[PDB]
Amino acid sequence: SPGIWQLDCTHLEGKVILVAVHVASGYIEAEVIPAETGQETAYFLLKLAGRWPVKTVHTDNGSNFTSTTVKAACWWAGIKQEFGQGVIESMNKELKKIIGQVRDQAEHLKTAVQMAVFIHNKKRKGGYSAGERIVDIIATDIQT
Amino acid sequence: SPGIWQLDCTHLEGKVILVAVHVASGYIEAEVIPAETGQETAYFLLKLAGRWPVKTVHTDNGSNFTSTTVKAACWWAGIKQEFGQGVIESMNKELKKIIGQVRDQAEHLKTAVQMAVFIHNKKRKGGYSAGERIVDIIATDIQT
Ligand SMILES: [Cl-]
Ligand SMILES: [Cl-]
């Protein structure tokens, strides 16, 4: 399903990383956030939904989506909580792997995360990349 | 050309907004940044390039791209400075228009910007939306 995303946080070096995975393609978007708050998650969601067609968001920590600030962002953006796992487990551990491998290519973690996001979305797997699959899946879906 | 982006900053309420426009489609990505520094622009660029195929970046303030931190991000990500304007002028003023119209739908400017980014990328113009045009242009280009 073209509009389903998975969202979780992961910790590294005393910092929080928010990771969103487009489930049908394995494409990721991540950000280093100051703290694991409702505000940060709501904000991230509103950004994601202006960039990709976000219909439903799945998470492995259900309580992350209970703040007033997260429901308000999902209400405004039209998002529902997905109620329907191999790809996501692979994508997150893979992310930390690439983070580990590019960590010395940058001073701060936040740069290293974006370098790993880039590496991950471009790597062909076969065999297209996740970034090629997500636009392929979205382009086909637009046209009926 | 599918990989050309335009980047500028704009000021509103004492704050800086970074606005990137995919030139062939009119699709936008924006962020409210703390300050107009080289670090912030480099970071934004590295994020953009892990999300969309960024080949060349055009700007209306050439000196924005002279810091060591911006050239390092463009060097790493493979980006060059575009050396080759109606769409972008329309897209930026339009952004402030929509920012003006949704400003009371949120407490902070940064939420309002993302609500305007969303509104802008989804609005059909005809007649597809910018978000539909950018994946159409990228999907076609992938396949030869
Ligand atoms: Cl750095
Ligand atoms: Cl707000």
Smallest Cα distance from B72 to chain A, Å: 10
Interface test with A, best of B32, B69, B102, B114 (most A CBs within 10 A): B114
**Helix A38-51 vs helix A68-77: angle between axes, to the nearest 10 degrees?**
10
Read off the DSSP letter of residue B60.
Answer: S
Q: Does A102 touch chain B (CB under 8 A)?
A: no
d(CA A121, CA B132): 20
List the determination method. X-ray
Read off the DSSP letter of residue B104.
Answer: G
**Burial status of residue A41 (CB atoms within 10 A of its CB: 0-12, 13-18, 19 or more):** buried
Rounded to the nearest angstrom, the distance between the alpha carbon of B127 and the centre of ligand 2 is 32
Could you say which ligand is closest to the alpha carbon of residue A107? 1
d(CA A80, CA B61): 41
- Residues forming beta bridges with residue B12, ordered by sequence position: B15
Start-end of H helices in A22-143: 38-51, 68-77, 86-102, 109-122, 130-142
The rounded Cα A38 to chain-centroid distance in angstroms is 16
Contact B114 A53 (CB under 8 A): no
d(CA A113, CA A115): 5
Start-end of H helices in chain B: 38-51, 68-77, 86-102, 109-122, 130-142
d(CA B121, CA B63): 28
d(CA A90, CA A106): 24
Torsion angles phi and psi, residue B45, rounded to 5: -60, -50
What three-state secondary structure class fits B15? strand
- Please answer whether residues A64 and A33 qualify as being in contact, where contact means their C-beta atoms are separated by less than 8 angstroms: no
d(CA B143, CA A132): 10
Return the structure tokens found at B16. 């800086």
- Please answer whether residues B86 and B96 qualify as being in contact, where contact means their C-beta atoms are separated by less than 8 angstroms: no
Which one of B46, B122, B132 has the shortest CB-CB distance to A115? B46
Resolution in units of Å: 2.3
Rounded to the nearest angstrom, the distance between the alpha carbon of A115 and the centre of ligand 2 is 29
- Please answer whether residues B55 and B40 qualify as being in contact, where contact means their C-beta atoms are separated by less than 8 angstroms: no
d(CA B28, CA B8): 11
Contact B51 A29 (CB under 8 A): yes
Q: Does B40 touch chain A (CB under 8 A)?
A: no
Handedness of CA A142, B3, B4, B9 (dihedral sign): positive
For A113, the closest chain B residue by CA position comes to: B47
d(CA B105, CA B111): 9
Smallest Cα distance from B97 to chain A, Å: 17
d(CA A17, CA A10): 5
d(CA B43, CA B32): 13
Rounded to the nearest angstrom, the distance between the alpha carbon of A121 and the centre of ligand 2 is 31
- State the fold for domain A1-144: Nucleotidyltransferase; domain 5 (3.30.420)
Q: Does A132 touch chain B (CB under 8 A)?
A: yes
Could you say which ligand is closest to the alpha carbon of residue B112? 2
Residues 6+ apart with CB under 8 A from B69: B38, B39, B41, B42
d(CA B78, CA B96): 31
Smallest Cα distance from A144 to chain B, Å: 13
Contact A53 B131 (CB under 8 A): yes
| Tokens 């409702």, residue located | A38
